[PDB]
Design a protein around this nucleic acid. Structure first.
Ligand code: MG
Ligand code: MG
Ligand code: MG
Ligand code: MG
Ligand code: MG
Ligand code: MG
Ligand code: MG
Lengths: 322, 201, 101, 162, 305, 132
RNA sequence: GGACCUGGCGGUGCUUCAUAUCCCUCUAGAGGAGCCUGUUCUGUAAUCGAUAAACCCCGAUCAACCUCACCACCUCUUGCUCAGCCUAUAUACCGCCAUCUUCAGCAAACCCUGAUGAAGGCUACAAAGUAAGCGCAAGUACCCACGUAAAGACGUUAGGUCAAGGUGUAGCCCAUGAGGUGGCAAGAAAUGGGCUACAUUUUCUACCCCAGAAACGAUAGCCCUUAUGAAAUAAGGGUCGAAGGUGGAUUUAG
């Protein structure tokens, strides 16, 4: 019947079952070919109750069908999701720059790349298991400034957006040799992750953990080696890395501490002593006491490498640029 | 109830209004007050105990009948007393009280049990522990027991008011089923002397 | 274009009743007496029996107009206690308000 | 022109504004029939209105002059049809003392007419519910009354067996 | 603020229009009249009076806020801004200062009202503290200014319902003082006519009370108020009764009788009567039956099993 | 959990109108009746007939005016009249609306033998009461 | 495997409370009898659904035919419908409910503590929380501000319902569609909830509360009318005149 029918929204709801269509048709459109002065025909005036020919109506129908098909095609169109580490993982994939502040204060210089996405569950009283998303996000702009965050929420997008904002608010500065490197070799134990980073020359690339690479890129660090030992909790790794980058002396700082001149002597260049950082003020006339055979509790792996005793097949592998 | 907590209960006895007290009066004046319920009356003749008894008797909320029955019992008692006294036998003023109300009161007094048994579980078994009853409870027991005796059914075709009257008479000089029951209860209590330490109050 | 087959059947029955009602009434009148002969009465009864079923007024069942359901149907509105309720709640029946009481 | 705000206020807000409320629409409204307007209308309609004579208040004078009281109603429902049966009915309340032409017929009329005729106030009250139209019903009632009166006046032979 | 101002003007205009429309011609006319007009010509008829159609001066309608606590170039106006809930804090400080001054020298608000006064949202504990402070101040023994300040918060109540309203005395046909009064009880209305003087009996609907009431309890009830007074047999009464059953009717009559007596009995006696509870309409009436239950409160059986 | 007309709190996003945002228990209290006719008074006749008509009319209106009804209609009757108050969006051209309206009036009139004269209420957006 | 976090549970400790609720206490009931009507199990060629609290005079504000879906027999095929289906999925759903609820919480959006772990965020002489929004409350109805209605969010239970209506998906489409005639329900039993008693506070008659008699109970049928209706389920009258002679463990309501 007619009274047994009902509104569309309800029907749609019924169809969907997400609780455990009228674009194409124009207000004058008909199955039968007809032409009314108000709609379908020109606005009022031709002014007569005309009807379409069979052929014309058929043509119209065909056109409509074509339009529908086109729409369907449009709907069913894959957009190219950039491949972050692994296709089907929220790895190095980029979110856009973090949304602007309350007063204004835009962050168009900054870029946001994800580091992990975990579906964290919690058993609550009446609700049962609550599927929350937890996301580790980093922020950086090049130029040495960067930070990170652990936004968590019931939705993914929400989590991302919180996280980006958090990152924007919590930034470290990371001093760099030139644009391209760490000032020196770092050895930091964070909780149970050990990270051994080595300073390298230009054209070495970033040969470190994928996350570590991404973070470096974000920072502005362009080329260096890093070994990640112990556990590999992502959060621990990230935080530890950040700490390491914060706590490395500049050459200027060193100079200040010691007097003296921080003079680098390259093998690439000649014997020529290049002075990097001299002290802003006085100069200590007593030279450093070169107490020979210096006690530095040094790593075994490095020693092995130097010697050639260890030869793992997964070490010097040809990889894609960074 | 449809009276608010603002509303307080009405003190009815009119000898109270025939003279801290002043303060109380003032307070009352300041406050609102409940209406006087039906049975509790201004009259000189009203006896509260008797009213209570009548209420107890009442079944199916048909009060008038109950009242009538109560009246009849009293009448019967009076008649009995007169028989004992006036024409038949000697005019023994001392041994025969004629006031039925007084007799009733005496009976009630007699019927009061100064100990009662509470059931208390311990280990996994039920013990009948003796307890000192408050006066109100005792009073209730008195009347209720009497009423149940009257009801019995072993007395059969006999009407109520007569039977009740008889019971009252029996009570008056320490006889009858109610008194026996009371005595039995007492005996039981005595038997469970030792279980007074099971009680925690 | 009625709600279901039952509804249609009911409608048909109603129509039949409307068609043959007067005659039925007459026959009942003829029957229901102590006045006048027995043979005549018998004949009348026979005639009534012969007359087709569904023209019978008692086979007319009440349903809701909207949903074809036989029970919970208020005869004031001719709709079911579900449909009626639905109507009421949105506020599409004048007068009908919830009994706060 | 009025800035009327019609609706229940939101927890920390205002009653809903004038320019898009269903509630206002729902209200049956008296924007027409402003007192002045009403007065004007009345003035306009002082024609159509022949004032009634000095037959006086208290209903005594009227009774003396006009006996009989017919009084039929008529209901004004909504919707496309106007056919309401209840409207057709008519009663005819007439005072028996005001009839003033009966001696023995007073004794007979009452006998004839059972549940009608109140004794506290001598009022015959025939009610006509038979025919469909109102006017015809009224006519019937009138006729009924007249015939009844005639019957009362014209005594029969069998009467004597009292 | 601009918007509000605009609305004010618009409101005024609307009012003027309304005035023009209605028979009351002047542009100056009261709020009550306006309300009446609105009722007449937008008759909602809804039970919620807030949901009814209204138009007023929008300074009554809108809930105002403390707009702009800092000017241009930051710098908040009031010195206790960074506390938050600043006004309350300021008030507290002032109170403290006053107390100190006093020391050197030698009913209450409700939370909602306080909030309204201030503008800021205020918790219960804070309110309590404030009250305590006020109390302390009061205790102190103060000058006039302090008293005035205190009064700003403290608001009166009006105490009602203590006396019984004494009816007239009236004389009809002959010189006889006769008091009319009326009582209801349990769907049973009464109307008693007590005559002062005229010693004897009570007529209920013409019939004498002895015949109208066969039962002793009802008789007692009828007697009651007179007995209480002490003026037992000194008044004749005619009493129209209607509705309900026996006992209820009797109760109603008693109530009415009491009321009548109030008319010409000493005020102290009236007070006593009131205290004793025979001048108050008992609002105990048969409870509505519910559609889940067998009776008004008794429910159908195995709810637990 | 009774859940008849009352629209459900999912988030703070759902824009809801005043009639739509009020539960059935408010009908006399904070709301009004949409339809208005004598039938449901007592004693009085022809309620059932009216109800069906009312049901039809709203549906018809919805069909005619697609995405051009902001809120539910108000049906009124005065003897032999059938007035309608539709709150419409300012979406389509006025000419089209005009064309529609007359047609509706004629068609409805011919159906029910009752002079209809509906009056529209142009409002640019749905008048939000709550963001539920 | 270790150590946490959140929950759930503990015949888990302390403290404080349930004012018809947990006990003692009250009052009237059920369980014993006959019926009335539901369920189960049985019977039948013959529905379906609900089926611990939260089913069991429940969907039904009603099954003689109808209703109706069920079963037997006999027909119909563009068929009331631009078909139809009370066919399968309530574990696809909307809609409309139950439930804890006789309760006060649930929340977006921020911020902080956890070396930035799952998480947590209480101290007014205040130690880090702030909050729109929904709920309680407040307003409303009814005989008031009391009471009772109504209201009661998020979730719980894949709780109830495809047979109220609508519909996703999957099927039947000379049949799981449609129409006709007849029929189908009766208890060896078990159990739930009613009614009525078992008598003297009673039974009958008057009167509707001062009376006079008596020393019950009222089905089951049996016949006979009456009402209804095409057709007998109800109502009355005669007749008969069961069991029962205050109910066990237990449990229901106020
Ligand atoms: Mg892949
Ligand atoms: Mg509920
Ligand atoms: Mg079928
Ligand atoms: Mg409720
Ligand atoms: Mg509330
Ligand atoms: Mg299930
Ligand atoms: Mg199921």
């Amino acid at each position: 019947s007619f009274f047994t029918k009902l509104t569309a929204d309800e029907l749609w709801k019924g169809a969907l079952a997400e609780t455990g269509l009228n674009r194409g048709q124009i207000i004058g459109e008909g199955r039968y070919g007809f032409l009314w002065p108000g709609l379908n025909v020109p606005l009022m005036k031709v002014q007569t109750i005309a009807q379409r020919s069979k052929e014309e109506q058929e043509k119209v129908e065909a056109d409509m069908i074509q339009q529908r098909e086109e729409w369907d095609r449009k709907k069913k169109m894959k957009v190219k999701r950039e491949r972050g580490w692994s296709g089907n993982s929220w790895g190095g994939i980029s979110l856009g720059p973090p949304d602007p502040g309350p007063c204004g204060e835009t962050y168009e210089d900054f870029d946001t790349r994800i580091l992990e996405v975990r579906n964290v569950f919690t058993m609550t009283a009446k609700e049962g298991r609550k599927k929350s998303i937890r996301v580790l996000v980093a922020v950086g702009n090049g130029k040495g400034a960067a930070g990170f965050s652990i936004g968590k929420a019931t939705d993914r997008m929400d989590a991302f957006r919180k996280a980006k904002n958090r990152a924007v608010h919590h930034l470290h500065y990371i001093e760099r040799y030139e644009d391209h490197t760490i000032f020196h070799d770092i050895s930091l134990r964070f909780k149970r992750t050990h990270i051994k980073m080595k300073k390298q020359p230009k054209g070495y690339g970033l040969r470190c953990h994928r996350a570590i690479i991404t973070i470096c890129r974000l920072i502005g660090i362009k080329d260096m080696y890093a070994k990640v030992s112990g556990s590999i909790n992502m959060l621990s790794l990230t935080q530890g890395l950040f700490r390491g980058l914060s706590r490395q002396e500049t050459h200027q700082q060193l100079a200040d501490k010691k007097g003296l001149h921080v003079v680098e002597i390259r093998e690439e260049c000649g014997p020529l002593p290049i002075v990097v950082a001299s002290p802003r003020g006085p100069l200590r006339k007593d030279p450093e006491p070169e107490d020979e055979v210096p006690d530095v509790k040094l790593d075994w792996e490095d020693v092995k490498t130097a010697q050639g005793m260890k030869r793992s097949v997964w070490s010097n592998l040809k990889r894609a640029a960074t | 109830s449809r009276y608010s907590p603002e509303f307080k209960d009405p003190l009815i006895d009119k000898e109270y209004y025939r003279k801290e007290e002043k303060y109380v009066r003032e307070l009352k004046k300041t406050q609102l007050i409940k209406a006087a319920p039906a049975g509790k009356t201004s009259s000189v003749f009203e006896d509260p105990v008797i009213s209570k008894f009548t209420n107890m008797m009442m079944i199916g909320g048909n009060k008038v009948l109950a009242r009538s029955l109560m009246i009849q019992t009293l009448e019967a008692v009076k008649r009995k007393q007169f028989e004992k006294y006036h024409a038949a036998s000697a005019e023994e003023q001392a041994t025969i009280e004629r006031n039925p109300y007084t007799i009733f009161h005496q009976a009630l007094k007699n019927c009061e049990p100064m100990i009662g048994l509470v059931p208390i579980l311990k280990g996994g078994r039920f013990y009948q522990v003796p307890v000192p009853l408050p006066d109100r409870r005792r009073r209730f027991l008195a009347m209720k027991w009497m009423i149940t005796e009257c009801r019995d059914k072993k007395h059969q075709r006999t009407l109520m008011p007569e039977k009740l009257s008889h019971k009252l008479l029996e009570a008056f000089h320490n006889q009858g089923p109610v008194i026996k029951r009371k005595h039995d209860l007492h005996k039981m209590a005595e038997a469970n002397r030792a279980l007074a330490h099971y009680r925690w109050w | 274009h009625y709600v279901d087959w039952r509804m249609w059947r009911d409608v048909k029955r109603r129509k039949m009743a409307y068609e043959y009602a007067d005659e039925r009434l007459r026959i009942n009148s003829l029957r229901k007496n102590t006045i006048l002969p027995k043979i005549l009465q018998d004949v009348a009864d026979e005639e009534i029996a012969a007359l087709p079923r569904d023209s019978c007024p008692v086979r007319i069942r009440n349903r809701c107009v909207m949903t074809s359901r036989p029970r919970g149907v208020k005869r004031r509105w001719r709709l079911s206690r579900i449909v009626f309720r639905h109507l009421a709640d949105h506020g599409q029946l004048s007068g009908i308000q919830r009994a706060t009481w | 022109p009025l800035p009327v705000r019609m609706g229940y206020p939101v927890k920390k807000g205002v009653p809903m504004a004038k320019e898009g409320n269903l509630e206002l629409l729902k209200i049956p409204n008296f924007l027409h029939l402003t007192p002045v307007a009403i007065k004007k209308h009345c003035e306009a309609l002082k024609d159509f209105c022949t004032e009634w004579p000095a037959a006086l208040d208290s209903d005594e004078k009227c009774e003396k002059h006009f006996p009989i009281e017919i009084d039929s109603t008529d209901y004004v429902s909504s919707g496309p049809s106007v056919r309401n049966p209840r409207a057709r009915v008519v009663v005819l309340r007439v005072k028996l003392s005001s009839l003033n032409l009966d001696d023995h017929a007073k004794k007979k009329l009452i006998k004839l007419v059972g549940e009608r005729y109140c004794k506290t106030t001598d009022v015959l009250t025939i009610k006509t519910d038979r025919c469909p139209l109102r006017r015809q019903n009224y006519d019937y009632a009138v006729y009924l009354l007249t015939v009844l009166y005639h019957e009362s006046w014209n005594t029969e032979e069998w009467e004597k067996s009292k | 603020e601009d918007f509000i101002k605009k609305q004010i003007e618009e409101f005024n205009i609307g009012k003027r229009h309304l005035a023009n429309m209605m028979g009351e011609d002047p542009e100056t006319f009261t709020q009550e009249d306006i309300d009446r007009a609105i009722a007449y010509l937008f008759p909602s008829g809804l039970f919620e009076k807030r949901a009814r159609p209204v138009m007023k001066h929008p300074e009554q309608i809108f809930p105002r806020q403390r707009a702009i606590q800092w000017g241009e170039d930051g710098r908040p106006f009031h010195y206790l801004f960074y506390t938050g809930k600043q006004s309350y804090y300021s008030l507290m400080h002032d109170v403290y200062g006053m107390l100190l001054n006093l020391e050197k020298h030698q009913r209450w608000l409700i939370k909602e009202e306080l909030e309204e006064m201030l503008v800021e949202k205020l918790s219960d504990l804070d309110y309590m503290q404030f009250i305590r402070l006020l109390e302390k101040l009061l205790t102190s023994q103060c000058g006039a200014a302090e008293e005035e300040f205190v009064q700003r918060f403290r608001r009166s109540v009006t105490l009602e319902s203590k006396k019984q309203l004494i009816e007239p005395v009236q004389y009809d046909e002959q010189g006889m003082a006769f008091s009319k009064s009326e009582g209801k009880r349990k769907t049973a209305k009464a109307e008693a006519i007590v005559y002062k003087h005229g010693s004897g009996r009570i007529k209920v609907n013409g019939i004498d009370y002895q015949l109208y009431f066969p039962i002793t309890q009802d008789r007692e009830q009828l007697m009651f108020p007179f007995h209480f007074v002490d003026r037992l047999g000194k008044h004749d009464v005619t009493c129209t009764v209607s509705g309900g059953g026996r006992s209820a009717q009797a109760g109603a009559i008693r109530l009415a009788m009491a009321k009548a007596l109030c008319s010409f009995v000493t005020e102290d006696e009236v007070e006593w009567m009131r205290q004793a509870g025979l001048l108050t309409t008992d609002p105990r009436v048969r409870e509505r039956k519910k559609p889940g239950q067998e009776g008004a409160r008794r429910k159908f059986t195995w709810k637990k099993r | 959990k009774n859940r008849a007309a009352r629209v459900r709190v999912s988030k703070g996003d759902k824009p809801v109108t005043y009639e739509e945002a009020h539960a059935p228990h408010y009908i006399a209290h904070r709301k009004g009746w949409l339809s208005l006719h004598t039938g449901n008074l007592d004693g009085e006749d022809h309620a059932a007939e009216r109800t069906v008509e009312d049901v039809f009319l709203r549906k018809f209106m919805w069909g005619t005016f697609p995405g051009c009804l902001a809120d539910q209609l108000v049906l009124k009757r005065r003897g032999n009249q059938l007035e309608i108050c539709a709150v419409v969006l300012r979406q389509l051209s006025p000419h089209k609306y005009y064309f529609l309206v007359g047609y509706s009036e004629t068609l409805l009139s011919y159906f029910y033998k009752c002079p209809v004269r509906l009056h529209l209420q142009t409002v640019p957006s749905k008048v939000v009461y709550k963001y539920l």
